[PDB]
């Protein structure tokens, strides 16, 4: 008779992925405070997205706002673009929606 | 200090898991109510991590770390090989009135003046013994806590047992400290070494024999040589006694005798040899040689005279 | 024999430091003064590289002071220890 | 020690060739500074080695 | 294996992202906004690189203290450095 908090369902995905990268046995008490770290990151992440959108004069959040954030984070540099990072870390089905490629009569999707 | 924390962590890591609670209870530096907060069901590493935090929250010096080391040591006491000292006194000297505090002060002062930096600890043991732990240093070096020296001194008696780790450098100094603190004129080292401190103690105090006499089958097989078997059994019983033998593990003999057998008759110089005996329980393997047929009925006295002579290393000349 | 590479390393570094200090306090006449100072510096580097000295061993100039202080500390400790032993 | 006069003789040729009075003053200033550095480092290194051998001998003495 | 300590995952779960979860969390905190249809995926990418950073820093702390099991004090120390670095 299981009952699961929907909020904990989302965090459980990244918590398991954490144990894959660690490559060390990890104590149970370390698990839940990583969950504590994640929600703090999400809260502060959303706050930053407000200002960058607000500065541009549009309330809607567009991808180039996310590019601007990651450049300040140091993830995106002159050599490593946004397209390069998607290729390395995301599956094929997610790649089609994000990165545009021309095919079948020079048709490009998404339009860029 | 970080050094005392590392010292305590290493000492605790040495302790086996099942008996850690008894050691912690005997040490009793940490408050009793603090102990049940820690859980010993979990991993050893987690337990030591928690214990370091508890002992760091309270003030921990180096003296209590040394005390923990002494307490851990006297539980195992077979991790080191021990040696014996004997002290002698003048004929007209009167029997002294031993005082523990004066002994501690004198043994403190001799080391304190001869060297400069030195740590010595005491743990007054039941049954009339004293445990001492010494960390050696000099004027221009801090004491080395990795290589301590342990000595067990039995008060009112001429005997003291010491561990041979680093004592080679400062042997005369410790000899002087022991002979001054206890009011004895001379000291000599008995040539008897072992890893079983209790067997050494039983031999040295000669109390391994405690029996006092007081009044208060398939007849088809014929065994010839029966009289020889009964005679060798009687001789073995007479020579090796009937008490449980004290447990040793080693014995060494050095030989400088001439070869006497046509062969090397003209030679006039001794034949130089060195032989050693090793066994898990020596003096029990030796007892069984003659009945098994590997030795003659009486063994040579060099082998049957270990506990009576309180001797372990021998030298023989022609 | 020529002296070690460390001598030129240290002297070069201290000369950039002192040139920076003296240019810090000067207001006018920048280009000519810095060109003349750089020419003097490079010519002194050439002269000291060409120079010949009997062989010797030298420790780095930065750490001489602290090691010297610990040497005095050891001096005092060993002196007092020896005096006490002699008195006894 | 031996090469100390060599650096000193360099000061003579620099001063004669240069003419700007402020430049001459600057040359004098940092030349005095580097002379101070030379003397301090030489003396400190020399006394350091001397007291090092003294320490070795005197610890031998106490032993 | 004890309940208290979890062994490293040999096999990673399918790389599918929880798109529905990201939309609601972004919705509740800042209701007034509307996010573009593909913006959810990029947020997922941003979260991966954060967790990747957190795992590396935690491992170094555990090895520095000579610990074979990642502990809570190791990862909290990791959180302070990464969280400040993650904000830009």
UniProtKB/Swiss-Prot annotation, chain A:
Localization per record: Nucleus; Chromosome, Centromere; Chromosome, Centromere, Kinetochore
Domains (record comment): The largest part of the sequence forms an elongated and flexible stalk structure that is connected to a C-terminal globular domain with a histone-type fold.
Disease / disorder: Short stature and microcephaly with genital anomalies: An autosomal recessive disease characterized by growth failure resulting in severe short stature, severe microcephaly, and delayed and dissociated bone age. Additional features include global psychomotor developmental delay, pubertal delay and genital anomalies.
Function: Component of the CENPA-NAC (nucleosome-associated) complex, a complex that plays a central role in assembly of kinetochore proteins, mitotic progression and chromosome segregation. The CENPA-NAC complex recruits the CENPA-CAD (nucleosome distal) complex and may be involved in incorporation of newly synthesized CENPA into centromeres. Part of a nucleosome-associated complex that binds specifically to histone H3-containing nucleosomes at the centromere, as opposed to nucleosomes containing CENPA.
Family to which the UniProt record says this protein belongs: Belongs to the CENP-T/CNN1 family.
Name of the protein in question: Centromere protein T
Swiss-Prot record, chain B:
GO-annotated cellular components: cytosol; inner kinetochore; nucleoplasm; nucleus
Annotated phenotype, changing residue 10 to A: Decreases the binding to centromeres
GO annotation (BP), single: chromosome segregation
Presence of the UniProt keyword Nucleus in the record: yes
Family per record: Belongs to the CENP-N/CHL4 family.
Subunit organization: Component of the CENPA-NAC complex, at least composed of CENPA, CENPC, CENPH, CENPM, CENPN, CENPT and CENPU. The CENPA-NAC complex interacts with the CENPA-CAD complex, composed of CENPI, CENPK, CENPL, CENPO, CENPP, CENPQ, CENPR and CENPS. Interacts directly with CENPA. Identified in a centromere complex containing histones H2A, H2B and H4, and at least CENPA, CENPB, CENPC, CENPT, CENPN, HJURP, SUPT16H, SSRP1 and RSF1.
Cited function: Component of the CENPA-NAC (nucleosome-associated) complex, a complex that plays a central role in assembly of kinetochore proteins, mitotic progression and chromosome segregation. The CENPA-NAC complex recruits the CENPA-CAD (nucleosome distal) complex and may be involved in incorporation of newly synthesized CENPA into centromeres. CENPN is the first protein to bind specifically to CENPA nucleosomes and the direct binding of CENPA nucleosomes by CENPN is required for centromere assembly. Required for chromosome congression and efficiently align the chromosomes on a metaphase plate.
Protein name (database record): Centromere protein N
Organism: Homo sapiens
Gene giving rise to this polypeptide: CENPN
From Swiss-Prot, chain D:
Nuclear localization signal, short sequence motif: residues: 52-63
Recorded family membership: Belongs to the CENP-U/AME1 family.
Superkingdom per UniProt: Eukaryota
Residues of the full protein shown: 252 to 314 of 418
Cellular compartment(s): Cytoplasm; Nucleus; Chromosome, Centromere, Kinetochore
Identification of the protein by name: Centromere protein U
Summary of subunit composition and partner proteins: Component of the CENPA-NAC complex, at least composed of CENPA, CENPC, CENPH, CENPM, CENPN, CENPT and CENPU. The CENPA-NAC complex interacts with the CENPA-CAD complex, composed of CENPI, CENPK, CENPL, CENPO, CENPP, CENPQ, CENPR and CENPS. Interacts with MLF1. Interacts with PLK1.
Cystine connections: none
Curated annotation (Swiss-Prot), chain E:
Pfam family, any one: CENP-W
Keywords linked to the UniProt accession: Cell cycle, Cell division, Centromere, Chromosome, DNA-binding, Kinetochore, Mitosis, Nucleus
CDD domains: HFD_CENP-W
GO biological process: cell division; CENP-A containing chromatin assembly; chromosome organization; chromosome segregation; kinetochore assembly; mitotic cell cycle
InterPro entries: CENP-W, CENP-W/WIP1, Histone-fold
Domain of life: Eukaryota
Tissues in which the protein is found: Highly expressed in ovary, liver, lung and pancreas and to a lower extent in breast and gastrointestinal tract cancers; such as those of the colon, rectum and stomach. Overexpressed in high grade breast invasive tumors. Expressed in many cancer cell types.
GO molecular function per UniProt: DNA binding; protein heterodimerization activity
Coiled-coil blocks: none
Main location: nucleus
Record has Ribosomal protein as a keyword: no
Function field: Component of the CENPA-NAC (nucleosome-associated) complex, a complex that plays a central role in assembly of kinetochore proteins, mitotic progression and chromosome segregation. The CENPA-NAC complex recruits the CENPA-CAD (nucleosome distal) complex and may be involved in incorporation of newly synthesized CENPA into centromeres. Part of a nucleosome-associated complex that binds specifically to histone H3-containing nucleosomes at the centromere, as opposed to nucleosomes containing CENPA.
Family per similarity comment: Belongs to the CENP-W/WIP1 family.
Protein name per the record: Centromere protein W
């Amino acid at each position: 008779r299981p009952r699961q908090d929907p909020h904990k369902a989302g965090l459980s995905h990244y918590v398991k992925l954490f144990s894959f990268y660690a490559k060390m046995p990890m104590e149970r008490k370390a698990l839940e405070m990583v969950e504590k770290c994640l929600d703090k990151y999400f809260q502060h992440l959303c706050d930053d997205l407000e200002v960058f959108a607000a500065h541009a004069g549009r309330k809607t959040v567009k991808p180039e706002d996310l590019e601007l954030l990651m450049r300040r984070q140091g993830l995106v540099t002159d050599q490593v673009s946004l397209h390069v990072l998607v290729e390395r870390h995301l599956p094929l089905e997610y790649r089609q929606l994000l990165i545009p490629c021309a095919y079948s009569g020079n048709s490009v999707f998404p339009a860029q | 200090d970080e050094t005392v924390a590392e010292f305590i962590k290493r000492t605790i890591l040495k302790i086996p898991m099942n008996e850690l609670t008894t050691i912690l209870k005997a040490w009793d530096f940490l408050s009793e109510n603090q102990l049940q907060t820690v859980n010993f069901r979990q991993r050893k590493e987690s337990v030591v991590q928690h214990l370091i935090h508890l002992c760091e929250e309270k003030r921990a010096s180096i003296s209590d770390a040394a005390l923990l080391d002494i307490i851990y040591m006297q539980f195992h006491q077979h991790q080191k090989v021990w040696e014996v000292f004997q002290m002698s006194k003048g004929p007209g000297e009167d029997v002294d009135l031993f005082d523990m505090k004066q002994f501690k002060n004198s043994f403190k002062k001799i080391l304190q003046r001869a060297l400069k930096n030195v740590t010595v600890s005491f743990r007054e043991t039941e049954e009339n013994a004293v445990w001492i732990r010494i960390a050696w240093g000099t004027q221009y070096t801090k004491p080395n806590q990795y290589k301590p020296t342990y000595v067990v001194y039995y008060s009112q008696t001429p005997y003291a047992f010491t561990s041979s780790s680093m004592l080679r450098r400062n042997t005369p100094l410790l000899g002087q400290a022991l002979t001054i603190a206890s009011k004895h004129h001379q000291i000599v080292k008995m040539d008897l070494r072992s890893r079983y401190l209790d067997s050494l103690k039983a031999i040295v105090f000669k109390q391994y024999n405690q029996t006092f006499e007081t009044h208060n089958m398939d007849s088809r097989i014929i065994h010839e040589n029966i009289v020889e078997k009964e005679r060798v059994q009687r001789i073995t019983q007479e020579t090796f006694g009937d008490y449980p033998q004290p447990q040793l593990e080693f014995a060494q003999y050095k030989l400088e005798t001439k070869f006497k057998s046509s062969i090397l008759a003209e030679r006039e110089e001794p034949l130089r040899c060195l032989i050693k005996f090793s066994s898990p329980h020596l003096l029990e393997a030796l007892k069984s040689l003659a009945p098994a047929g590997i030795a003659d009925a009486p063994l040579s006295p060099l082998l049957t005279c270990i506990p009576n002579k309180r001797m372990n290393y021998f030298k023989i000349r022609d | 024999q020529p002296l070690s590479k460390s001598t030129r390393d240290h002297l070069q570094t201290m000369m950039e430091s002192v040139i920076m200090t003296i240019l810090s306090n000067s207001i006018k006449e920048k280009e000519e003064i810095q060109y003349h100072l750089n020419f003097l510096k490079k010519r002194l580097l050439q002269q000291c590289e060409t120079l010949k000295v009997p062989p010797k061993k030298m420790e780095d100039l930065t750490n001489v002071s602290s090691l010297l202080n610990m040497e005095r500390a050891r001096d005092k400790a060993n002196e007092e220890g020896l005096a006490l032993l002699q008195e006894e | 020690n031996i090469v100390l006069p060599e650096f000193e003789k360099t000061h003579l040729e620099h001063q004669q060739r240069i003419e700007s009075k402020v430049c001459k003053a600057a040359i004098a200033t940092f030349y005095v500074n580097v002379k101070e550095q030379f003397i301090k480092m030489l003396k400190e290194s020399q006394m350091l080695t001397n007291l090092k051998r003294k320490n070795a001998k005197m610890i031998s003495d106490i032993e | 294996m004890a309940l208290s300590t979890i062994v490293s995952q040999r096999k990673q779960i399918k790389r599918k992202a929880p798109r529905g979860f990201l939309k609601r969390v972004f919705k509740r905190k800042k209701p007034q906004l509307r996010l573009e249809k593909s913006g959810d995926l990029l947020v997922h990418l941003n979260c991966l690189l954060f967790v990747h950073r957190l795992a590396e820093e935690s491992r170094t702390n555990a090895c520095a203290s000579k610990c074979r099991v990642i502990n809570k004090e190791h990862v909290l120390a990791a959180a302070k450095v990464i969280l400040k670095k993650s904000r830009g």
